[PDB]
Design a protein around this ligand. Structure first.
Ligand SMILES: c1ccc(-c2nsc(N3CCCNCC3)n2)cc1
Ligand SMILES: c1ccc(-c2nsc(N3CCCNCC3)n2)cc1
Ligand SMILES: [Cl-]
Ligand SMILES: [Cl-]
Ligand SMILES: [Cl-]
Ligand SMILES: [Cl-]
Lengths: 154, 150
């Protein structure tokens, strides 16, 4: 849970594909609906994330994106260390499962509001990142605190 | 500028449209290529920005987006105060002009690398936010908002 470490997570809703990056130390996320989880989609998503936050390491969500030359090229371009996402600490899988369930619940709670899934996913990213836990600091507050504490030391 | 204030900027390249949000105090940006600058696209862009960073106020880039009920609805949903983008300080026009020129120069420098403009714009966002000016814009926005939290 160093300041630069993120995890990719791909979840499905009604067969549409939601790709999520979770900053491990804070639980802050960014997410997008994508047409299918291809190398090309994941690479582009990682390029966006790393221009916006200081992404040092990413634990990839599966072996296809770990292997993908397109994902490796974007990781090289953006100075990201690509790593596997094997849950050596088994509590990792349950934390990700619980986030996906939370995200899907919020999506459901905004269905009277968003015509397209992509809006509902961004409403969910907003409510996730601003939720005070359960501190009570939010994930958005913690990621900024963590990275700023890192700049002032290293 | 206060830690929550952002400015929208829309620039064109090839007749494709690039929409940029600039965090005024730091110069950090996020940007997207969009098919045309509609209320719906601007609104969606603001909803994404405000889920990622604490967006208190946005200076909108033109009167159409200031007026748009779709943009006002996103601003209401995301708790953003919508403001005009009138350069009461005329040096603002120039700072945004220069950033657009710098963004387009980076886009040009990555032509041998990105097949699609959308990739080039995100490589430009990356190089802009990491460039040491010596802190980078990315460092400054985190510093600014963290000072505000504490
Ligand atoms: C995503 C990323 C960062 C944030 C975020 N940073 S500071 C902050 N707060 C500032 C102090 C209380 N006022 C509003 C909350 N919130 C929120 C979502
Ligand atoms: C977008 C948003 C934030 C950043 C960002 N924050 S801290 C950081 N570091 C840059 C160099 C490595 N360690 C010193 C601090 N860089 C970069 C781009
Ligand atoms: Cl693929
Ligand atoms: Cl793509
Ligand atoms: Cl290949
Ligand atoms: Cl849209």
């Amino acid at each position: 849970s160093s300041p630069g470490i993120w995890q990719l997570d791909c979840t499905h809703l009604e067969g549409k594909v939601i790709l999520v990056a979770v900053h491990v130390a804070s639980g802050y996320i960014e997410a997008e609906v994508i047409p299918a989880e291809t190398g090309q989609e994941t690479a582009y998503f990682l390029l966006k994330l790393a221009g916006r936050w200081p992404v040092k390491t990413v634990h990839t969500d599966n072996g296809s994106n770990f292997t993908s030359t397109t994902v490796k090229a974007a990781c090289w371009w953006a100075g990201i260390k690509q790593e596997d996402g094997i849950p050596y600490n088994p509590q990792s899988q349950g934390v990700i499962e619980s986030m996906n369930k939370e995200l899907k619940k919020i999506i459901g709670q905004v269905r009277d509001q968003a015509e397209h899934l992509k809006t509902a996913v961004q409403m969910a990213v907003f409510i996730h990142n601003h939720k005070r836990k359960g501190g009570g600091y939010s994930a958005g507050e913690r990621i900024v605190d963590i990275i700023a504490t890192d700049i002032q030391t290293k």
